[PDB]
Amino acid sequence: DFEPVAIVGISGRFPGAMDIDEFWKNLEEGKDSITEVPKDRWDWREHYGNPDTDVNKTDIKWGGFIDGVAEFDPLFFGISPREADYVDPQQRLLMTYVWKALEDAGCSPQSLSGTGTGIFIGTGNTGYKDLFHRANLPIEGHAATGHMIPSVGPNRMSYFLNIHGPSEPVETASSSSLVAIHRAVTAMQNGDCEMAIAGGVNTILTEEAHISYSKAGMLSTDGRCKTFSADANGYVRGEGVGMVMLKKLEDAERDGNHIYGVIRGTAENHGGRANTLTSPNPKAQADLLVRAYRQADIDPSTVTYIEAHGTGTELGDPIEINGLKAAFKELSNMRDHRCGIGSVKSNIGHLELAAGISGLIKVLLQMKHKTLVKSLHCETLNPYLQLTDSPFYIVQEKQEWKSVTDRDGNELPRRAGISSFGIGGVNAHIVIEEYMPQPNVIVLSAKNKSRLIDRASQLLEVIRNKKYTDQDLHRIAYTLQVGREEMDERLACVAGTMQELEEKLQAFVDGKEFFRGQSHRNKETQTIFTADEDMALALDAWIRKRKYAKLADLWVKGVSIQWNTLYGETKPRLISLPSYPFAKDHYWVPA
Amino acid sequence: DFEPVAIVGISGRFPGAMDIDEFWKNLEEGKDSITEVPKDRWDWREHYGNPDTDVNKTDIKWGGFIDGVAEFDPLFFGISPREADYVDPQQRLLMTYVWKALEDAGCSPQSLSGTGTGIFIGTGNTGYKDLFHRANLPIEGHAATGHMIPSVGPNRMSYFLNIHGPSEPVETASSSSLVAIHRAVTAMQNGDCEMAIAGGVNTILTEEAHISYSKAGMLSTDGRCKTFSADANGYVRGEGVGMVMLKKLEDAERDGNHIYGVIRGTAENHGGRANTLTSPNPKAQADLLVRAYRQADIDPSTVTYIEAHGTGTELGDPIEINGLKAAFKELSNMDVPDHRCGIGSVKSNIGHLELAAGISGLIKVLLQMKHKTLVKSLHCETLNPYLQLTDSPFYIVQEKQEWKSVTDRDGNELPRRAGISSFGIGGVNAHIVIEEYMPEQPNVIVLSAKNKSRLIDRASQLLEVIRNKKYTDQDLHRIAYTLQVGREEMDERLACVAGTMQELEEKLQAFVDGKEETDEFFRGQSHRNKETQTIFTADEDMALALDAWIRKRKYAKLADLWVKGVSIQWNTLYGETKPRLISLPSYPFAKDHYWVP
């Protein structure tokens, strides 16, 4: 009765990682990305002291910060540069990475127009309005939708994409982004929407949260999330953004989507009465997991990895493990298992509002490369874990993520779980299952010449590091033809090999074969082909006779081509390609 | 596959309305509760000017404000008075009225403990943290859960009630509280929870929003939501809190709940691309309504009232009407000829409660069903020429009138059916379909509270509600049973035996008046009579002795035992059919003032 949900597109930026590619690169190398507070945020020395004694002071000087938090391309999203200064980075990073996730999925925006597609994002206030305050800036009308109402974030994207599904901010503290997944998946089951975009955005803009959380005894004086370790003394704060596009497995299998993984079950609850308000409850975390896997209807012995919430607290880490053991014990009862446990927070810190979506993306990447990456700082384990009799073990060293085998001698899809818990007591768990499955015209378009060149370089430098072969050519061509918005500045070339394409892209970037045009400058050429049955026949013949160079020459001028007719009944499967290279223009608090 | 949901308990506080009872009194009188901005908030003269030209100035000086925004009983909820200063009034008002809603329903916290009951509240930052910075108060650890993270509001109450359902803040601007109803009802279908508490809380703590919203052109320079009027020029900001307890109708009828109304269908969408980001979409409002009434599976001609979003904007109101007309037309293209449906807006009475707007609309309708009356919509003596309702089933309720019943094809009256709309400036829309619910001997009346002061308050509340004849002798057992099994058993206890409301009134007054004790009522403290309690529970023979006294109706004796904290199984006092739970005055929390240190 539960319809499985396919993850057909992902995007994200993390500490020490510009994109998903570098994010995986850092996870494979077991890299630590936590640094000291950059001085463009605030000077830590100016607020340094002892939090237990010194007023308005903190000994926390670390954090996981991203790059280009102030960067935005407002004209792309129909916003003026003047109004862009009032727009919260939470909303700017939202729109930017929702779009990237759409392009990664190969979903043309024009296809989304009018659809009942939902948006659910982990977001909230992070201090942008507080920066306006400090600079003694005049209260303007733009502030209302700019940085006073967090729900405008997803709502603004819904307005931009012309989608009619539920459009909501999700704020359950550190569970927010994973609750968004649950909320989104739930919405697709009762028909509140057909497709969904879920994720989280977390930025660290002032020192206030650092000071308060420090005095609350939440943060590590070492500045590291030493999860599962015996040195666990708190967590380190992190920034980031992550998006996923969700489609029903039926539809994704039917529409030619590429799939990162399948969600077999979701679960959300509250810890009820615990020892304190901010104390995790292992009975509740146990019941949570049980509900998730019963919904998924999978046997626990097949679950081979768990992305823990794992913040690196002396008390919480053992509590989370107890919940896992009790859950899997009870699950076996109502019917040699070995299951790994890790935490990406050891790499990039606690992303809080974007914590859950970070763990999910890490898991998806772990499925892609069939590898269980190292969990950091846990060289010596917490003695209170008690993992010997249990199926569980901490991934202290990077290893292959082997598959297990049915009693019918058949291979099994890898299965993982992701947990995300909030200090308020809101818990969330997700169950992910691994998914088991002559020339063409290559087209590229952008808003201007510079962005087009950026697009080319992206595709160029992604062929150069050998991501694809010549069997992926038509999967690339098709995805670029039907899975990209047709913008004004256009570039087309004919290619049969990755070599040929690389040569021609290299030629365009360098400044020299290939076709080049602007859709708005050829409105006269556009009349002579638009709305005519005899022209339609002629175009139909060009496609049949494979006059690719001539077709490409028309397309760059803004002439519509039915790219579908180049292919048979079964279209090439959509493929992951570099998403839009937005302008890195600085937009911040005005003077 | 839609299980209807019953509203079994409500609570609230609105501009010029201390409680739900007074809220209805004002609506029935057509009272306007909008005032100028109170001075303990800010000085409107200090910030006056032309918002189009002057820096940080505004000509909007009105608003809908509630009383006791700073009041709280932190010891009741296990919070130190020191911590209470750091707790956002959003969270304080949340816990207070969530509890009041539970007591209204007759749901005891002991029964609720361990249940997967969810909470969904329209809430967010309202500026309490800003007041800290204005006083240059140092950043402390308490600030984190106190007023930095909105979700702690609902989460704290879930912690306090030991409930394990989803505990979320709902924030979609002016549709938050109604989206909360939708999110809650939705959660009760997929088994995320069995019961739910939905609502909203809205406080106006600084002048910042007044200024910014004014310069955004959102607010009326007359300070009135003149909904449906030709003078419509914006809305007036309002404060308030509203709560509802939701149960599946199946359980509500089985468990003996008293029901305010039934939710037959809900819906939530987004307007998508409109003319501007803050422009409503009549096509989207139409599709929303269609989905809702399809889910309810009711004939449009049976719907006789619509609580409009009705902000009193010049452009929004016609768009809302156009959405309605297109929706009922599309619904009639597929029971009652001569379809005639009323339209009204509580915004005309108390203004736009923003976060708490939707719940204020739901409660207005519930009251209208209770008294079978459509109250007057204010400020619309001259209708907006863009409405054009003549060739449609719709009319504006410009005068108070009886909410008349309608009849099916046979000779049978139908339950009253109404809808509530709530839209956000972000584009989030929500709609809810409500249906009217169609349903000597002595006893022990018991009352408990945290202290002797609250116990006297509890008595005064009950005593007075009797004297204003809200009750008859037909109700005495419903009262008794509700106080026996639908209240938390607290330390300071008062019990008396009564067979009539008169006998009860005289006994409560005897306790209230002085002193004045021959003790024809029973008084005691639970904590001072331990052992005696253990004796009667841990021993099999004393337990049977106690069971005997219940079955023999030894009222005065059980009363003596109960005020000493001895556990009485009140169900043994009744047959298999228990009396239906009844609405009674909820806990009289201490009005202790807590604000920034």
PDB file of N, CA and C in Angstrom, chain A residues 96 435 491:
ATOM      1  N   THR A  96      18.584  28.553  -5.997  1.00  0.00           N
ATOM      2  CA  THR A  96      19.740  28.116  -6.771  1.00  0.00           C
ATOM      3  C   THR A  96      19.872  26.596  -6.815  1.00  0.00           C
ATOM      4  N   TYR A 435      19.079   1.164  -6.307  1.00  0.00           N
ATOM      5  CA  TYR A 435      18.286   0.872  -7.494  1.00  0.00           C
ATOM      6  C   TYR A 435      19.034  -0.031  -8.474  1.00  0.00           C
ATOM      7  N   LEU A 491      24.452  27.097 -28.376  1.00  0.00           N
ATOM      8  CA  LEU A 491      25.614  26.467 -28.992  1.00  0.00           C
ATOM      9  C   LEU A 491      25.290  25.029 -29.387  1.00  0.00           C
TER      10      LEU A 491
END
